[PDB]
Amino acid sequence: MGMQIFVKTLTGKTITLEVEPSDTIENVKAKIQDKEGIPPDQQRLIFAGKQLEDGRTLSDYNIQKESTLHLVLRLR
Amino acid sequence: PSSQKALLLELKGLQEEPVEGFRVTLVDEGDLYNWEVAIFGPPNTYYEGGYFKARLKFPIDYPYSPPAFRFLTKMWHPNIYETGDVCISILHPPSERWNPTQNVRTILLSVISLLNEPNTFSPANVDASVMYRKWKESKGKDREYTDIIRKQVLGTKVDAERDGVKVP
């Protein structure tokens, strides 16, 4: 519902996203690919020291409105 | 030198905006090339409640040459040596290898990633690597890896009490 969250790149760029609590992490990376072209398989999202798993949802991490995620990349 | 200005800047920016679960301080104020890292394991992980200590050492030419990251606390982990040295690609000569654009905030975030998801392809400790892969492949049925993690964590409470730090 209605809610935005922010995603910080390693360059200092803040990417703003439109999301629902029911959205998975897998499709938030979809959200990110759409803006930055980074393939979801190399994306990694960090919140409170945790790397969020694909197939869980924003609600299971209780990520509330306007929380800022941190992006890191991994090939392998 | 550009080093000393560069380091002083990343310090103020790291203290004005910490990386969650990391605290940055100088070993001795008036030396900027050596730092102390206080590290708090996150809730709902096996590192829960734990307090960890590491040090960073910066070369004369930073940020042209990468610094060294070493744990004072003893850590069992596929990418951590016996000495406490972290093996992480971005600290050796894409955004995963060292170049003058890189910085401390980036290193930290990269280590969190490595704490979460070890590099089992090119590990520095393959006993821990084997054990981790076994823990993973068994869907949690094997407790050998996790029991070790719990114990070290439980041990850190002595370090906290000894340092006077209250663990949130």
Ligand SMILES: COCC(=O)N[C@@H](Cc1ccc(-c2cc(Cl)cc(Cl)c2)cc1)[C@H](O)[C@@H](O)C(=O)O
């Ligand atoms: C073998 O598993 C060890 C472990 O605890 N792994 C966790 C991820 C994890 C998350 C955060 C860190 C973490 C983050 C920070 Cl910022 C500091 C520290 Cl010391 C560890 C470590 C691992 C997993 O979620 C694990 O709980 C699980 O539930 O499977």
